[PDB]
Symmetry: D3
Subunit: 163 residues, 6 copies
């Protein structure tokens, strides 16, 4: 029938993870390029589950810890055509549109540094796919106007992403 | 793992857009995407902050739509989900702008059809969207006559095609 | 309550399939145009599940084989606002970014020529949605340096997509 | 090489967008870009076919704007130039859609300011656009007070920013 | 002061030319990739005027005639950071959005198979820039409604780009 | 009638400049955001020639040197709706696609760190437009196979933008 499995995603402090689905072996080189040409100091590991042929986890990196995190999560999800990116010295918003526009990339499941689970379906031996993710925690309530003011201030005075 | 079905209310004249993003700036960037797309668009946006205070963050120029968006976020109750309700605009008027907001990771639905969201709860307070049910299944396959009728609809009625 | 079903996706040799979610009847015409204006000589079929009103599988094609493959998969998936595209004489990378930018298109579940299953949830009679896909097979191992050299060679000497 | 200046009329309530494209499908694709961007947009589009019959090709849902666009194409008289006049929409509502039309190669201007097009004629019937003059040169540099005033304009008046 | 020069662009039957401006040496590889990954049968030459360093016309191609056309036009325009693409077996609409989205690419001056001139300004020795182009001929008149019907028919029955 | 002027563009070592055309006052804020959200630690100045009303050079920056460079160039070009961006700690390729997709931006004339001139037409007092630019220098020759190997090596071993 269908077996659901939960995969916990380790996210060390200072990293962000991006998980998606693509196709074709060139994914690995195109994602390498999207990352290194987006932010000069970026440190990353990228791994991609080739789904046919030799069926290898394909990987590039300029940081060995991040390479191994990416590889290990691909091994655990173990679903054809999934890719995993771990990054330091850059935020997902710095690279996401580049990633969306890689022609091999078909969808992105998560971009986050929160506690994160991946929900995987195994339908037959060695046939697995991503069902969804659980990105952080459910809401505790609704923000107030003063909470709104606070987050506006955060964006303007702290991270300076807005004026 | 438990699955839950969330019914999505869609008042006449509105459309809903449901997706997933990350980072608090989501709500400001989605506000701008909408307001700069269509003059006179009316909307409510709500976004599930998934860490820290874990507050539903919201922007709107219509209070009915604000509160619909907030309600649905609370019902779905999945981290980093956003909901947009719109009036005086169609999803096609705004969707490419939304896709290109850097915080936005994925869109699950854009529609006015009867709609359900399928949510997985894996543990208390840890939920995610596993799909949507957008309207109903097919009743059959269109004929050449049906084709001619939808071609005329797009050219004579809504005038989106020549 | 919720029933999960598995739909097998036929893929004749020489074809690729792209499956996604959209909305609005204009989907069919816009995807037609996206395909035909991308690659001279592309052969395709496109079907879309209109999810209200007449609830007809809507379709366009320049190849009858591919039309019927697209229509048949839509009948089997049977989920509102899902679209299916079968292509010959073009690869998904040749058309995907065009498809992504169609304003009706909201998400793409798969683009592939691998063995492929679609996981569909039926929540009540006539109410179905796509939960995920199973694209090819789980990984057999992790790429070695030697395997990386072979992948690089393939991209440079065989398909000539990299220099 | 001779240079000519073409004055561009801009009626109150309109904006003009001038660029360069190629291939007859330009006009249909620009029509669709506009009509699917903003409900109730009013427009005229004209495009200079630069071979074959060399006819100005045009689409519109407003006759005043159609004819303005046609007139300007004739005055510029440069192969593969297009002109769009719009009402009930702003250029920012439609420009990204226009940029992404595959026939469109470049955009010279989007504005309601007084505007001139600079055209080079190299030989009879062989002309091209060499630039535009969009409004007037700067009178000075804004102060912090001026800054605060434009920030308030964008947040309190047009509400494009928070 | 400023010297204006007119460069005539040869366009052999069955080719199209794309002329633009970019920056950075990676332009040449990224444009190669944009072209070869857009249309399977595409034949092309691409040349780019490196504007500093060794200041070479940089080039890639899978067709030697087109390579030489591209190189020769770069030599004649002789303006820093200009690029030239000649293509067969594909139309500009098949590749243009990919080209626009190459991060090195800053503008496109022309995409056409019409009689074409490039207007170049030389301001000082070996300092040249593109002022504009003359793409085909000035209009002879305004199309009628029946002319409109004819071009609609062309798009629907002949090239089949619209329905 | 028409006077042509040549504006020299100062480019301190470590900076790049991007010059373009936009419209509407929101240009300044949207370009600010495009820059700051692209690369952590980017330093920039952005100036824009408001072309009606008060006709003020509008500006935003996180670095006073770069602000004044941007403002000064706008004063010298002195053409309505032109924008200038100077950046440190980021390359144009890191930000260009974001800039291209700002809805106010209509065209980009240059992105470079080379010697650069802007050609401005003055058609009457206070009425100026950008005609073109002269980005670096004319080519000295055509790339040999040996030169191509060196270019490839540079991209793979030095800047690591290609594999
Ligand atoms: N300054 C920032 N810039 C860009 N993205 C951020 C920033 N801070 C947090 N994020 C992203 O937004 C998510 C939620 O924010 P946080 O409140 O830090 O848990 C993080 O997991 C990051 O993926
Ligand atoms: N005129 C229109 N323009 C754009 N989108 C539309 C229009 N009419 C319907 N839609 C969208 O397409 C979906 C299906 O349409 P309907 O067949 O009218 O139920 C709706 O729920 C809307 O999201
Ligand atoms: N030469 C190619 N160009 C583009 N896409 C390809 C190519 N070869 C394979 N693919 C795609 O990548 C997927 C996996 O490749 P394969 O290893 O050939 O089974 C296929 O299912 C195709 O969708
Ligand atoms: N069937 C076509 N598909 C795509 N582009 C075309 C086609 N025919 C012509 N073009 C382009 O449109 C331009 C003008 O068309 P023509 O009427 O063939 O001179 C040509 O120079 C080509 O660049
Ligand atoms: N509210 C607005 N929304 C979008 N664009 C605008 C708006 N107001 C003015 N513009 C554009 O910006 C240009 C400069 O504005 P103004 O200062 O009002 O002359 C105009 O010619 C319009 O093209
Ligand atoms: N490492 C790099 N990454 C990105 N862009 C660069 C890099 N090096 C040079 N550039 C850009 O390409 C242009 C020409 O390069 P150069 O050969 O270094 O003078 C410069 O003016 C920069 O704008």
């Amino acid at each position: 029938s269908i077996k659901f499995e939960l995969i916990d995603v380790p996210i060390p402090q200072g990293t962000n993870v991006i998980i998606g689905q693509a196709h074709f072996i060139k994914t690995v080189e195109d994602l390498y390029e999207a990352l290194v040409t987006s932010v000069p100091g970026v440190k990353f590991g990228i791994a991609f589950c080739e789904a046919s042929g030799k069926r290898l986890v394909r990987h590039e990196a300029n940081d060995e810890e991040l390479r191994n995190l990416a590889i290990d999560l691909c091994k655990k999800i173990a679903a054809g055509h999934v890719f995993v990116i771990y990054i330091r010295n850059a935020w997902p918003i710095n690279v996401l549109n580049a990633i969306k526009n890689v022609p091999e990339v078909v969808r992105i499941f998560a971009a986050t540094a929160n506690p994160l689970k991946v929900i995987v379906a195994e339908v037959e031996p060695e046939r697995r796919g991503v069902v969804g993710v659980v990105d952080g925690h459910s809401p505790l309530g609704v923000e107030t106007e003063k909470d709104r003011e606070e987050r506006k201030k955060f964006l303007r005075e702290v991270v300076k992403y807005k004026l």
